Design a protein around this ligand. Structure first.
Ligand SMILES: Cc1ccc(NS(=O)(=O)c2cccc(C#N)c2)c2[nH]cc(C#N)c12
Ligand SMILES: [Zn+2]
Lengths: 80, 69, 1099, 401
């Protein structure tokens, strides 16, 4: 089946496009969702990414998790 | 008073003959207005570097990298 | 559609001031920035000598003096708000003053975003570069280098995106900036080195430190201290690396410090100014070392006293400090060593009138219109009454009829001030002495003959010329006496310090004044009887005698002592010259001659030749004029005594006339006493007046201090008084000082039951003649009065003051409750008639065809006023964001929105509701609006531009009918707070008259033109721009371009009246060069003169 | 700690009025979409995108099928005039990507250029290819266009008959391959009238402009200017139409469509042969990913970063390495100059996927580092909405969805 991933600890300036940039080279992406602040318009610093195939999502998690992006270590995990 | 003694004097004669109007007016307030009819050419011209910072930087670094060998 | 904008009053707020040696290396200069104007002064013995004023084509944002290694005097660096950079030099050869543009260019960056705390311009102490903070994230460096044709600026990326203040440090091997920045973590101070070779930053001399959260200012301390001082809300800190010193003095905790300046060149002492107008000294305690050097031991702050609220401070010389105020009058103050009884060390020497900010204003006919403003803020709050004409501040009035002449006199030779006033009567003379009042007798002077002249002469002697004799007086005694051979009467008399010419009928006799001797030099007989005489020595022994005759009605210049005729002028008519005078104005010599019918002739006069040129004529009064020179504020001017008293003076090398606001003056003389410095003595048929004259200019201004902030003003003719909203700060409540609202005759307090430092609002009733606060009505706790109108409503015959308010709470952030209150001022007290609750802030109100139009938040509402004395809503309009401004004409309503431009409504009487006619679809952050006419709407916005909107008179469809088209655009350079229909002139090339009031205290006038006049004057502009050079080499067209961050657009449909008027001030050849090619056909340099003269009469 | 009314008192005495000082405070006016949309469009599938920068328009798009063509997509864009509380008037309706059978539901985005409110630009995306649709639609006339009136006079026309500037569209489609080039709207559109399009094999700078009785790109390589007029092999095939959709007539007022191209393979091969310190151990290159780092829109410089995968000798046997080339690209000249060349790092066991992700992270890092804020004047507007609030340029007016 597909696979949602939490992506958090993002610099507040990372865009939905940038996540697509960083994650997409791993596999097909069913949906990317960066949580925005409805009041300010800036991101909440976190979001979810859905890979069409889970074995891909797993590689992305492995490769990207705990690694600095914009100087902020990126967190990536499995979500029910 | 300690802190007010020795207040700077550039010319002792300054304000010596200062007498103000009885409604606190002393200085003349209507200077002749400068209206140039003729003008001296400017010796130099101020201009900005058109090159982007990041360009300039990345060019520099590389230029002093190949200058290593 | 076609508009014309001219200055009626130049900006008066001080934005910056700097001191240095700019004109010469020796002299000491004060330079003052008033928006677009740069004033240049030289410090002298008497105080400030004006040298030069220059009008920049830009708002001056940065103004720094600096001296590079190979320079004899300081250079001036200016940056304007539109990023015009220049380096300027004062040059002088002989008498000719020029400002040289050493360097110029525009430093704007497209990529850049203007910073929170605005434009900051700093120069390295070793003049190695100029640093600019223009935008968040970028530091612009202009390397200073003589041997280049291109001063190439570069940007250095700055990781700190929110910079509060930056300075260059002293005593550094590399140029080093020190700055305060804000981040989530707080406020901090950091240093960087600026390397020109790397076009990059380097790690600075010392590390970063967390500082005060309210830290707002950086001071670069000079050697031998080096390092920096950081000023916070309640803390002052010194840093120099290993050394860190911090003081938290309680004294500074009350208010915020907003400006500073260095007193001692080595930085041992600094002046600091706070928001409440307190003045402090910051002392740095030196520590001498075995090694030649000096370390900072301690920091002390000391309260010196109170000044105006200072925008900027500068120490001048001999304990004299110039206080430049934005919110109040500017000042010269003295710092003393001894305090006064109140414990104050500060003494005011001079005050300069600042109208700014004009927050509201109205035109009243107190046939000449007077303008009354709401001026200033906080303790500086005031009303200013502005009139055309000149006023006399009377200090004394004495019952003395039949005065036939008037002379000032120094009795003591060592006294350099007048102590005596000699008066003339039909056959008598009386002598008066100033403590104060009361008369005397002067030895050597006669009292039983009429004095025709008297006063101080050469060799420490005195003179008196009567109808009988000339008396020279020394120890006061008669030391010489001249009489006519046959003892005939002297009929006319004139005298300087050295010479005497007297007339005996047609006989003329020339005397000289020597030690204890009146020496007859020569004699002659004129063709006709002598009417009047003058021998003023022009730039103290005259080679010239000016004479007016009977019979031929002639003015003549005669050589002395030969009495040879150099020039005869037939004045014409059957009326004799009454008074004649030779005078200098602006190192230019004139003969002035006044006829007994009230006409005045003035000529240019050549000392060497004696030639009169340029008979110009003016009409002053019906009665004969008597001319007398006087000195006022270091300038020589002529008083013309008549039924219409006038001062004659010079502006831009041309003679100007201004009415003095008195009934009639027969005779006058200047009076420089100890009690009345540079005063004037005036005499009508019955009174001797002593008083001070207001500044010699077009505008005459009166100040009514309130000691709290005025907010709105309106006039109530029927009550013969003004209503003024004001607010005072009270502390947690109890007031800070007595002010207008706490000192009324009567007072009232709101009793409505409808609903850290605090504001307390009031409606002030102020007498229109005396400007006494007759009554003050205090609003509810937390109620802010926003709007005010005086008017009649409905069928009700009473006239009311109506106030719109808003409830403002600490734990809330926008208004949701408000009130409209109807007051009646009757029998000395303010009565509350009616009160209407509303669900927001009542931003604006206008009377509208006997109804009350109001704006509440984003709603515009129309109320009717019922029989039952209540406001009843008729209709609403809700399509606004924030309706702050309302203007009406007929059934039309112009709506100004803070963020959403202008909107035109109409009231439909049959439908009984509003209709949106059209709106301006450009976003514009409005400050003020006016209706110019039915189809033309004037707006001023937040970027200092004016624009004019029109209904589309070509609209075919209804959709097109609904756009307001922006047909006029113009960068004004001011922030408009109020627009007003009216004129300061008595009252054609122009239609309509809208005055405006600005934050900087500028008063302007907008008027309309025909397409024809516009096309002529626009062409004129373009020609004037090719002839007239702009200091800094800024293009006029660039300056006047409509400029916002979204768009930049050339000005259209607007003529710069100031430019146009300056055509009268250029040289004749350059005048002709402007008119080079033109049609009527060909060039009428004199016809264009006649045209512009018309345009100057609109104000 | 600030209150609206305290801020306004400040304004009158200081004369500093700026959107960024009230940015502390809550929206001035919120409106509900339910309350400003008409009844007819209420169940016709509109998805509202946002406000124009000028704040005069909300606009939206629709995605319907119909006919016998199920799972077959039509895209229309619509301009609505916002008038606060009153209902949104419909000003323009326009079909996107003409002549085009779309067998899949697109991710759609509309953009406005920084300083050009005359045209708007729309992007549509999405078995080892990816399809990209791009449309440039004229913006409705601000007020009353004299030329537009002539279009309803000199030509009888009717409602929706407009002149060229205020009524032309331009379509285009291209394919794209792994690694799928990033979407960089802020850079792609930083120069007015121009969009930079990454085809995987080249970068194409296209420009449209209207003129009346010169060149937006190549002034003073692959250039492709041609003209079109009103009335009935190249890098990037396109269709130029009017609002109704009639093909515009070529010329050889009027329209100018330009196309400057940068062939990645040329650039790579030449930077190695010329500038690379290791070009004499290079063999060949497998794959590349081009990311825009900056666009200097006045000087017309485009800085790009080229991530490479290649084969080279170590200094025995060849092996695959990763590097990045940095290249400037004049738009007036058409010439590119090397800015920087990186070292080779052995890719060993890392997949291609993780090599590209890792290359892109370093690009993001770099942009972020050198990022300077802009004025509200010059930002590229990007609108999107998939399946809460639509805010003005300044967030003082909200449409609550
Ligand atoms: C590397 C990178 C840079 C920029 C963008 N997007 S952008 O051009 O819209 C942008 C965003 C934020 C600031 C700016 C600026 N100045 C520009 C990218 N999108 C996906 C990316 C990947 N990998 C990527
Ligand atoms: Zn058109």
């Amino acid at each position: 089946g597909p696979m949602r991933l939490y992506v958090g600890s993002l610099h507040f300036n990372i865009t939905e496009d940038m996540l697509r940039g960083i994650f997409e080279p791993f596999g097909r992406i069913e949906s990317i969702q960066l949580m925005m602040d409805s009041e300010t318009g800036r991101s909440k610093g976190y979001g979810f990414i859905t890979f069409s195939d889970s074995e891909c999502a797993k590689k992305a998690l492995e490769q990207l998790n705990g690694f600095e992006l914009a100087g902020r270590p990126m967190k990536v995990g499995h979500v029910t | 008073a300690d802190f007010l003694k020795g207040l700077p004097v550039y010319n002792k004669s300054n304000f010596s003959r200062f007498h103000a109007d009885s409604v606190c007016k002393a200085s003349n307030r209507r200077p002749s207005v400068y209206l140039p009819t003729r003008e001296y050419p400017s010796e130099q011209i101020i201009v900005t570097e058109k090159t982007n910072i990041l360009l300039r930087y990345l060019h520099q670094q590389w230029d002093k990298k190949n200058a290593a060998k | 559609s076609y508009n014309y904008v001219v200055t009626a009053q130049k900006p008066t707020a001080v934005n910056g001031c700097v001191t240095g040696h700019f004109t010469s290396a020796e002299d000491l200069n004060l330079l003052i920035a008033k928006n677009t104007r740069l004033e240049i002064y030289v410090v002298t013995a008497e105080g400030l000598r004006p040298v030069k004023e220059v009008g920049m084509y830009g708002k001056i944002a940065v103004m720094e003096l600096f001296r590079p290694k190979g320079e004899s005097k300081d250079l001036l660096f200016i940056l304007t708000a539109k990023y015009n950079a220049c380096i300027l030099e004062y040059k002088q050869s002989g008498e000719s003053i020029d400002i040289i543009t050493r360097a110029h260019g525009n430093v704007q960056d497209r990529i850049g975003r203007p910073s929170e705390t605005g434009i900051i311009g700093i120069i390295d102490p070793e003049c190695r570069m100029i640093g600019l903070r223009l935008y968040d994230g970028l530091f612009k460096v202009i390397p200073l280098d003589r041997d280049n044709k291109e001063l190439k600026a570069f940007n250095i990326r700055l990781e700190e995106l929110h910079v509060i203040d930056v300075k260059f440090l002293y005593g550094c091997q590399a140029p080093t900036i020190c700055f305060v920045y804000q981040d989530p973590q707080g406020r901090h101070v950091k240093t960087y080195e600026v390397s020109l070779r790397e076009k990059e930053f380097n790690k600075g001399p010392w590390k970063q430190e967390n500082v005060e959260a309210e830290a707002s200012m950086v001071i670069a301390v000079p050697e031998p201290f080096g390092g920096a001082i950081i000023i916070g809300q309640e803390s002052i800190t010194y840093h120099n690396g290993d050394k860190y010193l911090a003081i938290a003095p309680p004294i500074i905790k009350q208010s915020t410090i907003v400006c500073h300046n260095r007193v001692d060149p080595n930085g041992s002492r600094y002046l600091l100014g706070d928001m409440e107008g307190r003045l402090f000294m910051l002392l740095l305690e030196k520590e001498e070392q075995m090694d030649g050097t000096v370390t900072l031991k301690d920091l002390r702050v000391e309260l010196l006293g109170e000044t105006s609220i200072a925008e900027c401070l500068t120490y001048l010389d001999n304990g004299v400090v110039f206080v430049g105020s934005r919110l109040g009058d500017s000042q010269l103050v003295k710092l003393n060593v001894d305090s006064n009884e109140q414990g104050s060390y500060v003494v005011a020497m001079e005050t300069f009138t600042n109208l700014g900010p004009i927050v509201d204003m109205c035109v009243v006919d107190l046939g000449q219109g007077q303008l009354v403003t709401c001026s200033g803020a906080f303790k500086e709050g005031s009303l200013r009454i502005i009139r055309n004409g000149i006023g006399i501040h009377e200090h004394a009035s004495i019952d003395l009829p039949g005065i036939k002449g008037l002379w000032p006199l120094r009795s003591d030779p060592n006294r350099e001030t007048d102590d005596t006033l000699v008066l003339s009567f039909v056959g008598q003379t009386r002598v008066l002495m100033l403590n104060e009042v009361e008369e005397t007798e002067l030895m050597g002077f006669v009292d039983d003959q009429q004095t025709f002249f008297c006063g101080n002469v050469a060799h420490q002697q005195l003179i008196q010329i009567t109808s009988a004799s000339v008396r020279l007086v020394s120890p006061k005694a008669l030391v010489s006496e001249w009489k006519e051979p046959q003892a005939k009467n002297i009929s006319v008399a004139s005298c300087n310090s050295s010479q005497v010419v007297v007339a005996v009928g047609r006989a003329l006799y020339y005397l000289q004044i020597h030690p204890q001797e009146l020496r007859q030099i020569s004699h002659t007989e004129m063709e006709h009887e002598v009417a009047c005489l003058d021998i003023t020595p022009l730039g103290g022994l005259s080679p010239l005698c000016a004479i007016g005759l009977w019979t031929d009605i002639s003015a003549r210049i005669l050589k002395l002592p030969s009495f040879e005729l150099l020039h005869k002028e037939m004045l014409g008519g059957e009326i004799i010259p009454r008074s004649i005078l030779m005078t200098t104005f602006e190192s230019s010599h004139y003969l002035l001659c006044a006829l007994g019918d009230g006409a005045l002739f003035y000529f240019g006069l050549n000392i060497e030749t004696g030639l009169l040129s340029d008979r110009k004529k003016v009409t002053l009064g019906t009665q004969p004029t008597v001319l007398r020179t006087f000195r006022s504020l270091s300038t020589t001017n002529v008083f013309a005594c008549s039924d219409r008293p006038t001062v004659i003076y010079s502006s831009n090398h041309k003679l100007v006339f201004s009415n003095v606001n008195l009934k009639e003056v027969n005779y006058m003389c200047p009076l420089n006493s100890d009690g009345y410095p540079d005063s004037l003595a005036l005499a009508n048929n019955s009174t001797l007046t002593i008083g001070t004259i207001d500044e010699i200019q077009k505008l005459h201004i009166r100040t009514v201090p309130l000691y709290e902030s005025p907010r709105k003003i309106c006039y109530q003719e029927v009550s013969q008084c003004f209503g003024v909203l004001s607010s005072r700060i009270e502390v947690q409540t109890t007031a800070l000082r007595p002010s207008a609202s706490t000192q009324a005759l009567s007072s009232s307090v709101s009793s409505s039951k409808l609903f850290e430092e605090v504001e307390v609002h009031n409606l002030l009733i102020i007498d229109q003649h005396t400007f006494e606060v007759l009554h003050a009505h205090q609003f509810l706790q937390n109620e802010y009065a926003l709007s005010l109108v005086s008017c009649k409503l409905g069928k009700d015959p009473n006239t009311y003051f109506i106030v719109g308010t808003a409830m403002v709470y600490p734990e809330e952030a926008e208004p949701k409750q408000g009130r409209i209150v109807v007051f009646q001022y009757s029998d000395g007290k303010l009565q509350t008639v009616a009160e209407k609750e509303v669900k927001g802030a009542v931003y604006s109100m206008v009377e509208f065809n006997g109804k009350l139009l109001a704006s509440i938040n984003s709603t515009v509402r129309l109320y009717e006023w019922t029989t039952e004395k209540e406001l009843r809503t008729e209709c609403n309009h809700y399509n606004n964001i924030m309706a702050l401004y309302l203007k009406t004409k007929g059934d039309f309503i112009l709506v100004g929105d803070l963020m959403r431009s202008v909107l035109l409504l109409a009231y439909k009487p049959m439908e009984g509701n509003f209709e949106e006619i059209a709106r301006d679809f450009n976003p514009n952050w409005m400050s003020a609006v006016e209706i110019l006419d039915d189809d033309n709407f004037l707006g001023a916005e937040n970027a200092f531009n004016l624009f004019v909107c029109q209904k589309d008179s070509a609209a075919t469809t209804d959709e097109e009918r609904q756009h307001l088209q922006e047909v006029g655009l113009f960068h004004l350079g001011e922030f408009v707070n109020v627009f007003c229909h009216g004129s300061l002139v008595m009252q054609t090339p122009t239609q309509g008259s809208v005055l405006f009031g600005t934050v900087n205290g500028m008063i302007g006038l907008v008027t309309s033109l025909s397409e024809s006049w516009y096309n002529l004057l626009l062409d004129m502009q373009n020609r004037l721009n090719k002839v007239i050079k702009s200091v800094g080499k800024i293009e006029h067209s660039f300056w006047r371009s409509f400029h916002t961050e979204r768009k930049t657009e050339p000005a259209t449909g607007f003529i710069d009246g100031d430019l146009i008027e300056s055509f009268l001030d250029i040289s004749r050849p350059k005048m002709q060069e402007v008119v080079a090619n033109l049609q009527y056909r060909e060039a009428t340099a004199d016809d264009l003169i006649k045209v512009v003269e018309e345009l100057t009469r609109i104000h | 700690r600030e209150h609206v009314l305290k801020q306004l008192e400040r304004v009158k005495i200081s004369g500093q009025l700026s959107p960024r000082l009230f940015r502390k405070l809550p929206p001035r006016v919120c409106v509900s979409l339910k309350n400003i949309v008409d009844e007819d469009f209420l169940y016709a599938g509109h998805i509202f995108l946002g406000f124009s920068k000028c704040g005069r328009y909300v606009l939206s798009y629709t995605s319907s099928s119909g006919d016998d063509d199920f799972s077959f997509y039509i895209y229309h864009l619509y301009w609505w005039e916002f008038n606060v509380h009153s209902k949104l008037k419909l000003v323009r309706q326009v079909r996107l990507f003409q002549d085009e059978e779309i067998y899949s539901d697109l991710y759609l985005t509309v953009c406005e250029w920084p300083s050009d409110a005359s045209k708007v630009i729309v992007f549509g995306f999405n078995e080892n290819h990816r399809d990209i649709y791009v449309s440039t639609v004229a913006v409705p006339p601000p007020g009353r266009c004299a030329a537009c009136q002539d279009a309803s006079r000199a030509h009888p026309g009717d409602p929706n008959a407009q002149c060229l500037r205020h009524g032309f569209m331009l379509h285009t489609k291209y394919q794209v391959v792994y690694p799928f080039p990033t979407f960089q709207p802020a850079f792609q559109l930083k120069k007015d009238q121009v969009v930079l399009l990454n085809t995987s094999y080249s970068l194409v700078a296209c420009a449209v402009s209207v003129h009346s009785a010169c060149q937006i790109l190549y002034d003073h390589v692959n250039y492709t200017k041609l003209y079109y007029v009103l009335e009935s092999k190249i890098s990037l095939p396109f269709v130029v139409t009017d609002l109704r959709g009639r093909n515009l007539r070529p010329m050889r007022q009027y329209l100018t469509v330009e196309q400057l191209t940068l062939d990645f393979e040329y650039v790579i091969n030449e930077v190695i042969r010329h500038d690379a310190t290791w070009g004499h151990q290079f063999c060949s290159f497998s794959d590349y990913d081009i990311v825009i780092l900056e666009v200097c829109p006045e000087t017309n410089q485009v800085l790009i970063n080229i991530g490479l995968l290649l084969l080279a000798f170590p200094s025995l046997r060849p092996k695959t390495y990763h590097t990045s080339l940095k290249v400037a690209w004049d738009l007036n000249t058409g010439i590119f100059e090397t800015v920087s060349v990186g070292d080779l790092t052995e890719v060993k066991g890392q997949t291609s996927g993780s090599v590209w992700s890792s290359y892109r992270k370093s690009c993001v890092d770099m942009v972020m580092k050198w990022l300077v804020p802009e004025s509200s004047g010059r930002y590229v507007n990007r609108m999107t909405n998939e399946a809460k609030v639509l805010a003005d340029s300044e967030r003082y007016t909200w449409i609550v969805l």
